Every structure is written in C-alpha cells, then in structure tokens.
Amino acid sequence: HTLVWGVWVNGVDQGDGRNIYIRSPPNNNPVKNLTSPDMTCNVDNRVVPKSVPVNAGDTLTFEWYHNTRDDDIIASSHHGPIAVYIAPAASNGQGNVWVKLFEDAYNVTNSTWAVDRLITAHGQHSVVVPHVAPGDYLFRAEIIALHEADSLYSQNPIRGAQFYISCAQITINSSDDSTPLPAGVPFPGAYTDSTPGIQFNIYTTPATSYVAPPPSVWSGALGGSIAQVGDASLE
C-alpha cells in the first residue's frame, strides 16, 4: 500500500503533485485485476491541471509514501519489482503505447528486491528523460508486490500480485527527437496469468530465479536507479 507524493527534476523537488500533476487515486489500495482499465493509470484516470516541464537528459525522480511523506514508504512484506513506462499524452494510455524505460527486480549482490531498496531510498526512484519528440507524456511508475502472488487474482480474487500504479503528467520541452518513441504495449493487456513474474512464490522459489514481466527495457532508455536524490525532511 503506497502512493506517489510528487517528483523531483535534477534533484529539485517539484512540490506536492497529488491530483495536480499526478493522476492520484483516492487511497493506496492495490490494483489486482490484470484485465481492468485500472491497470492503465489506477482507479481515477483523468487529466489533472499541471504537467511537469523537463528536458531530454534530465533525471525524473518519483517519490512514494505509505500514509505520510517520507514514512515507512511501503510495508517490507511487499517484496517485488519496479518498472517505469512512458506513453504520449494524446493516447490517454489506451492502445499499444507504453514503452519501458526502467526495470529492477532482484539484486543478487545485496540480496534485495527493488521494493526493499525503495524503502532504503525514502521512496525515491528515477529515470533519465529520453530523446523523444517534444510534447506531453504520461510516465507510469509500477510497483508489483509479490507477497500473495502464489495465487492468480483471476482464480482467487482475495489473493494475487498487487500493482501500485501511478501516472505523472510530464512535458518534454527541449529534445532533439533523435530516439523517437517505438511501439508500445497495452495496459491492460501486456500482463496475463501466464506472463513470467505475475504468479511467483517468493517463500519457496529463490529470488535469483525470478523473471520480471516483459516487455524488455527499450534500447533508447537512459534510466535510471532506485536511490535517494533529495531530502524531503529539509523542507
């Protein structure tokens, strides 16, 4: 159970984005239904009044929280991977539009899941803004908590992989469009019951064996990291 507070650009806090430049849902409940329109940008997908200006090569940092800013972030039980996607705003995230800019699942050296390192990072994870066409974009940040992912929601609706999905409205101003955006996957649609990484038993299967859901990260990406860029407590 987690939500996005706002973003940072190049290490500079852009301010509370909830219902402003983040298409925020009303609470931190997960999405579980892989076929639901809620997979696109969570349960209150509508245009919000602001879009954060960035340029290609900027660092865009999402900042998550549980109940209040810079708290425990997400329950430690919610082991799983983190991904970020991009699509043009004109799509409203419909169709074959979502391109992956970032993936982190399990780090064998540190023996930590992406979620574990998100907590250590005070909720902060980043991508580098790609050289796509200037214009309006949706950046879709996705945490998958696997603690009840031994079951499929479609079979048992009180269990399943949990998706914490947040869409940020981002305007890319300066870009040479040297890496124009390639075809995307649909959400809902890309994840199915047979997709690698959707049904997994983190209690019995070694984390080293985990494979995150495709698609692969676009070669045009520059992303990106799970790491604290800014100290929220100084404000």
Ligand SMILES: *[C@@H]1O[C@H](CO)[C@@H](O)[C@H](O)[C@H]1NC(C)=O
């Ligand atoms: C899952 O989403 C689909 C598409 O909106 C819907 O038809 C189905 O009823 C949903 N399942 C549940 C259990 O609500």
Ligand SMILES: [Cu+2]
């Ligand atoms: Cu939760």
